[PDB]
Design goal:
Blueprint (H helix, E strand, L loop, with lengths): L1 E5 L5 E3 L2 E4 L5 E4 L6 E9 L3 E11 L5 E6 L4 E7 L5 E14 L2 E11 L3 E8 L1
Antiparallel strand pairs: 1-11, 2-5, 3-4, 5-10, 6-9, 6-11, 7-8, 7-10
The structure holds 2-aminomethyl-pyridine (2 copies) and magnesium ion.
The site of magnesium ion has 9 residues, from β4 and β11.
């Protein structure tokens, strides 16, 4: 089963802005070093390995972000954003990580800015 979280649906954020996305809806853009977004109430119904996909774009090299649960109580890992050659040239990167069942605040934190994100998809 899959859960799709629209990236623009965050409850809290720092130093980002929403913009119309070429794939419909909105994406988060104007992401800098130290920008972040937080999504409450993300349910992982079983304990085990999940695929977490990120629909991202960048016209530059080096965009990088970390994902975490509960404000860094559990770090899930870090994602590099490819240089897809345009701000609306989208691609899907992923991480495979182990989470125990629960409902968590899910956080994305920009280590190196210059990347956009459309959505997050979680699959077990
Ligand atoms: N965990 C992403 C984040 C960072 C700072 C504050 C809230 N959430
Ligand atoms: N050059 C646009 C931009 C601004 C802030 C963050 C990332 N890209
Ligand atoms: Mg979106």
């Amino acid at each position: 089963n899959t859960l799709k979280i629209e990236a623009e649906s965050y409850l809290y954020s720092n130093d980002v802005q929403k913009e119309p996305c070429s794939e419909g809806g909105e994406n988060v853009g104007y992401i800098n070093n130290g920008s972040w977004m937080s999504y409450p109430g993300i349910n992982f119904p079983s304990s085990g390995n999940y695929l977490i996909e990120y629909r991202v774009a960048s016209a530059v090299d080096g965009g990088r972000f970390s994902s975490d649960l509960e404000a860094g109580e559990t770090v899930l890992g870090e994602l590099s954003v490819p240089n897809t050659g345009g701000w609306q040239n989208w691609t899907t990167v992923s991480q495979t990580v182990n989470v125990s069942a629960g409902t968590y605040q899910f956080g994305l934190y920009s280590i190196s800015g210059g990347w956009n994100i459309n959505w997050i998809r979680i699959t077990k």
